[model samples]
Target: RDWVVAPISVPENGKGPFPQRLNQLKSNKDRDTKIFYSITGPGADSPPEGVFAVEKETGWLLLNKPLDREEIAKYELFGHAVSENGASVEDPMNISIIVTDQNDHKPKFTQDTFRGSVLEGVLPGTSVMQVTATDEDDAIYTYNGVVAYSIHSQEPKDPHDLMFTIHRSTGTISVISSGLDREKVPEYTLTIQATDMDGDGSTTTAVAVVEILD
Candidate 1:
């Protein structure tokens, strides 16, 4: 009655040496049965290949390398159990390998540097620029892949550092003071940081240049 086994799970972006054992496959035949195992599916020797392999004699399923959920999230493989003489013992079973996501990807900025301009005497809290980054993790709507922006480093630290502020959730850069001067400081360089996983995981950096308009 229960020919299909429970689905197995694999952590995405695993840091493994090689040939990680994913799970085991078994048949419900009697003890006298000598069975052979095989897998055929997306991650097998077919299209989108080289992800999974099963031992013909041992019935052990393994992953050749770490997986990227962004590239291929779930694998649906058909498991076969047959006698040594090549006669089918049980019908092919559906085995689903779910790739559980991990925070192993760093955010990436679309450009290395962003450019914007602000009036010399613009009011505080005025928008200066916006910097955005993308993460390849599976949590697009969630915090894992969702990015938050902040100021990593700045030139002319301290008093000059108070000139800019960044929105943590929106990545919007803004002026925080009224002392911006084109002659005193022609341009401002800000090292913007983007973090994912609710600010506890991976981080990436980008540069933002704010030009003071006379």
Candidate 2:
């Protein structure tokens, strides 16, 4: 069977509900890779509700809301007919919707052991060595990736004081508080976490060992 199809339209920012111009669509007989589908709107201003938002940053159109995690694990859903300007035909149906990438990062340690040395007795609060890590993604999105570092096994009143700080902009780690007695605890095991997704339930962790010497 033959069906009427519309040309795919790209959207401009802050200007449209995009138009729903029509073209010709042919039926697929193979039902494997022979067919593709799309939906149009007045100007491409908003995606259908309950689907992932197709932000302008991405180059392709995506669902306005995310699918159930289980459904995605099993199968793929084609585009829905719901559009922003379905009722208003003359408003503007040809819109460009872009697909944006989400930051799903799992933090990792660059090395198993980090080494640094200090004089026999260095003064407390002194800045020591720096640690570096890299994330494999677009620099802009990766920059938004948040990783926090802390000493996980310290048996003190506040273990947070033993942690070093990382500078996201420079990728530098410095000892903000330096009351170290190498003879007692020459090595510190640190737990680092990298998290994204509105900072709630989704997170990934990495660990490393920092060693000190005379």
lDDT agreement with native, every candidate: 0.82, 0.39
Worst 10 residues of 2 by lDDT: 69-78
The sequence of per-residue lDDT tens digits that candidate 2 reaches over residues 116-140 is: 5554355544445555444432345
| Model 2 TM-score, 2 decimals | 0.40
lDDT of 1 by residue, 1-214 (tens): 4356688877787877678886777776636678888889999968778788888877888889888777788889888888877888888888898887877789999999999998887898899888889888767546778787889877765345657889988889998877776777888889999999867778889899988887
Off by over 4 Å in 1: 13-24, 29-33, 47-51, 55-58, 140-142, 156-159
* Candidate 1 global CA lDDT score: 0.82
TM-scores, all models, native as reference? 0.81, 0.40
Off by over 4 Å in 2: 1-99, 141-164, 168-171, 176-179, 196-202
Kindly give the stretch of ten consecutive residues in candidate 1 with the minimal lDDT sum: 154-163
